Design a protein around this motif. Structure first.
Motif, short mmCIF file in Angstrom:
data_model
loop_
_atom_site.label_atom_id
_atom_site.label_comp_id
_atom_site.label_asym_id
_atom_site.label_seq_id
_atom_site.Cartn_x
_atom_site.Cartn_y
_atom_site.Cartn_z
N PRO A 112 -13.39 -6.46 8.39
CA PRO A 112 -13.00 -7.87 8.27
C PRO A 112 -12.04 -8.10 7.10
CG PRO A 112 -15.22 -7.55 7.47
CD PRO A 112 -14.83 -6.27 8.19
N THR A 113 -11.88 -7.20 6.15
CA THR A 113 -11.04 -7.43 4.98
C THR A 113 -9.59 -7.01 5.18
OG1 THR A 113 -11.67 -5.24 4.24
CG2 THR A 113 -12.98 -7.08 3.43
N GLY A 114 -8.64 -7.90 4.92
CA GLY A 114 -7.21 -7.65 4.84
C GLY A 114 -6.86 -7.17 3.44
N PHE A 115 -6.05 -6.14 3.39
CA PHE A 115 -5.53 -5.50 2.18
C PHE A 115 -4.00 -5.68 2.14
CE2 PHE A 115 -8.81 -1.71 2.35
CZ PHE A 115 -9.88 -2.56 2.17
N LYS A 116 -3.44 -5.64 0.95
CA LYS A 116 -2.00 -5.88 0.79
C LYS A 116 -1.23 -4.89 1.61
CE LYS A 116 -0.22 -4.13 -2.80
NZ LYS A 116 0.14 -3.14 -1.75
N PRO A 117 -0.22 -5.31 2.38
CA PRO A 117 0.55 -4.36 3.18
C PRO A 117 1.37 -3.40 2.32
CG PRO A 117 1.14 -6.62 3.74
CD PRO A 117 0.23 -6.69 2.54
N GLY A 118 1.64 -2.22 2.85
CA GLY A 118 2.35 -1.17 2.13
C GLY A 118 2.01 0.18 2.73
N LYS A 119 2.50 1.24 2.11
CA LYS A 119 2.21 2.56 2.67
C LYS A 119 0.83 3.04 2.27
CE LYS A 119 6.69 4.47 3.76
NZ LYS A 119 7.12 3.17 4.36
N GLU A 120 0.29 2.48 1.20
CA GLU A 120 -1.07 2.80 0.73
C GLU A 120 -2.16 2.15 1.59
OE1 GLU A 120 -1.38 4.38 -3.71
OE2 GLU A 120 -1.23 2.19 -3.46
N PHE A 121 -3.12 2.83 2.21
CA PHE A 121 -4.26 2.40 2.95
C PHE A 121 -5.25 1.68 2.03
CE2 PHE A 121 -3.94 6.28 6.06
CZ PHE A 121 -2.93 5.67 6.79
N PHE A 122 -5.39 2.06 0.78
CA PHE A 122 -6.27 1.40 -0.18
C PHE A 122 -5.46 1.07 -1.43
CE2 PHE A 122 -9.07 3.94 2.51
CZ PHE A 122 -10.19 3.14 2.70
N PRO A 123 -4.68 -0.01 -1.37
CA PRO A 123 -3.87 -0.38 -2.54
C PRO A 123 -4.82 -0.92 -3.59
CG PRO A 123 -3.73 -2.07 -0.91
CD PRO A 123 -4.51 -0.97 -0.27
N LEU A 124 -4.69 -0.38 -4.81
CA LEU A 124 -5.61 -0.72 -5.87
C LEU A 124 -4.84 -1.34 -7.04
CD1 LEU A 124 -7.93 2.44 -6.05
CD2 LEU A 124 -8.11 0.42 -4.58
N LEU A 301 -17.18 0.76 -2.91
CA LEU A 301 -17.35 -0.04 -4.11
C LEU A 301 -16.10 -0.80 -4.49
CD1 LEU A 301 -19.15 -0.71 -6.59
CD2 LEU A 301 -18.23 1.37 -7.65
N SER A 302 -14.94 -0.19 -4.38
CA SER A 302 -13.68 -0.81 -4.77
C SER A 302 -13.38 -2.07 -3.97
CB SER A 302 -12.56 0.21 -4.59
OG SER A 302 -12.43 0.51 -3.21
N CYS A 303 -14.07 -2.30 -2.86
CA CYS A 303 -13.79 -3.45 -2.00
C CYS A 303 -14.80 -4.55 -2.18
CB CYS A 303 -13.79 -3.00 -0.52
SG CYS A 303 -12.55 -1.74 -0.16
N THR A 304 -15.81 -4.42 -3.04
CA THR A 304 -16.88 -5.40 -2.98
C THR A 304 -16.56 -6.75 -3.57
OG1 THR A 304 -17.86 -4.71 -5.07
CG2 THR A 304 -18.62 -3.57 -3.10
N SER A 305 -15.45 -6.95 -4.24
CA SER A 305 -15.09 -8.32 -4.59
C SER A 305 -14.17 -8.97 -3.57
CB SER A 305 -14.39 -8.39 -5.95
OG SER A 305 -15.34 -7.99 -6.93
N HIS A 306 -13.76 -8.29 -2.53
CA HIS A 306 -12.96 -8.95 -1.50
C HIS A 306 -13.71 -10.14 -0.92
CE1 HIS A 306 -10.47 -9.51 1.96
NE2 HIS A 306 -9.61 -8.56 1.57
N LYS A 307 -13.03 -11.26 -0.66
CA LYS A 307 -13.70 -12.50 -0.27
C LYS A 307 -14.57 -12.42 0.97
CE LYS A 307 -10.97 -15.83 0.44
NZ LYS A 307 -9.87 -14.93 0.88
N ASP A 308 -14.08 -11.69 1.93
CA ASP A 308 -14.58 -11.24 3.18
C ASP A 308 -15.35 -9.93 3.16
OD1 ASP A 308 -13.37 -13.53 4.35
OD2 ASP A 308 -11.44 -12.48 4.28
N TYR A 309 -15.76 -9.45 1.98
CA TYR A 309 -16.69 -8.31 2.00
C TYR A 309 -17.90 -8.65 2.84
CZ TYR A 309 -19.66 -4.54 0.37
OH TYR A 309 -20.47 -3.43 0.31
#
Ligand SMILES: NC(=O)c1ccc[n+]([C@@H]2O[C@H](COP(=O)([O-])OP(=O)(O)OC[C@H]3O[C@@H](n4cnc5c(N)ncnc54)[C@H](OP(=O)(O)O)[C@@H]3O)[C@@H](O)[C@H]2O)c1
Ligand SMILES: O=C(O)Cc1nn(Cc2nc3cc(C(F)(F)F)ccc3s2)c(=O)c2ccccc12
Length: 315
Positions: A112-124, A301-309
């Protein structure tokens, strides 16, 4: 029975082959072996980085006339960095091109979580938090609906959506196509009774992932519970003269779930498919359900503050 009726009117094989972590140099032969021994459903994803090699196997077995395209049920997922309306078709088409197909039987919103577009699958960010995109679930869903109306996909669905997120789509204003499937983690340590009953009550089919507890997950730790080595499950298996893995695969089947165990080991690919020849008792079923401990393979863990986590929520 080998297939389940989805709410788009198509039938889905209840056993599929998983391909997460299958190395690109071994998955072509894995998928070939799998089709050869009876599998007709393959679970794929862009993010698994192996769709091209999966596709080689599919195309060869089609060319060889081992199976017809109509008999196969090919699933892929839209990754988090492509949730924007303008990126969804190209993401799907890249997946089709790699799998060397002209349509998918089912395409899922992978998370359910959208991540910033780019070549990185997990942009941090510099502190290791994933960078969200400002897209929401409902506009992504409308983009998925357009793929049906363009004939690129026969069915659309969701993955790792909690009951409130499922409900958000079902209540979506102007909803055109309901989700056909919700693919979620599900095994005796994470039994998911409430989410499964909710989805089934709405005519949404549930697919159980990591049914063996993903022993090759790269973040595995010694203290983690291990399904395949659990004496209690081993005992149920012994009772049935089957392997522990066979019991773990048959368990979701008997809950009216689709189950998609992964292997690149030909002996195991075959073993895992021989689950239509025996039954767990109702008592076995309730006993396996009793081992729930709300343990998840997949909850980064790196995703748990996403609004839609999705996993703060009880379910
Ligand atoms: N929607 C999503 O977010 C999501 C998330 C996770 C997984 N999934 C899908 O679900 C599939 C299955 O989940 P998974 O890959 O996490 O794990 P899994 O299927 O629970 O476990 C795969 C592991 O089990 C081993 N194995 C397979 N058959 C065995 C058998 N009969 N006896 C003993 N060991 C056996 C495999 O080894 P070998 O390969 O060495 O034989 C591999 O190490 C994935 O590949 C992916 O397609 C989807
Ligand atoms: O994705 C697969 O199929 C397997 C999968 N799982 N995970 C654990 C994850 N946990 C998440 C949690 C969210 C969240 F929604 F919760 F924010 C979003 C995204 C993820 S990825 C991974 O980190 C991963 C990395 C590469 C390839 C596949 C995977």
């Amino acid at each position: 029975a080998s297939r389940i009726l989805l709410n788009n009117g198509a039938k889905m094989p209840i056993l599929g082959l998983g391909t997460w972590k299958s190395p690109p140099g071994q998955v072509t032969e894995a998928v070939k072996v799998a089709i050869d021994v009876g599998y007709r459903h393959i679970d794929c994803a862009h993010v698994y980085q192996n769709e091209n090699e999966v596709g080689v196997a599919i195309q060869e077995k089609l060319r060889e006339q081992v199976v017809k395209r109509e008999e196969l049920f090919i699933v892929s997922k839209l990754w988090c960095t492509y949730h924007e309306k303008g990126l969804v078709k190209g993401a799907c088409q890249k997946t089709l091109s790699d799998l060397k197909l002209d349509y998918l039987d089912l395409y899922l919103i992978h998370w359910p979580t959208g991540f910033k577009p780019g070549k990185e699958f997990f942009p941090l960010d510099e502190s290791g938090n994933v960078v969200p995109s400002d897209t929401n679930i409902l506009d992504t869903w409308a983009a998925m609906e357009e793929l049906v109306d363009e004939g690129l996909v026969k069915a659309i669905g969701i993955s790792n959506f909690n009951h409130l997120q499922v409900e958000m789509i079902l209540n979506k204003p102007g909803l055109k196509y309901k989700p056909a499937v919700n693919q979620i983690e599900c095994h005796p340590y994470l039994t998911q009774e409430k989410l499964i009953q909710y989805c089934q009550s709405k005519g949404i089919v549930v697919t159980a992932y990591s049914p063996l507890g993903s022993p090759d997950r790269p973040w595995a730790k010694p203290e983690d519970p291990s399904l395949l080595e659990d004496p209690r499950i081993k005992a149920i298996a012994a009772k049935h003269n089957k392997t522990t893995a066979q019991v773990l695969i048959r368990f979701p089947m008997q809950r009216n779930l689709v189950v998609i165990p992964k292997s690149v080991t030909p002996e195991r690919i075959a073993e895992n498919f021989k689950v239509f020849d025996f039954e767990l008792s109702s008592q076995d079923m309730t006993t396996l359900l009793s081992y729930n401990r709300n343990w998840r393979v997949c909850a980064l863990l790196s995703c748990t503050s996403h609004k839609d986590y999705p996993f703060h929520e009880e379910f």
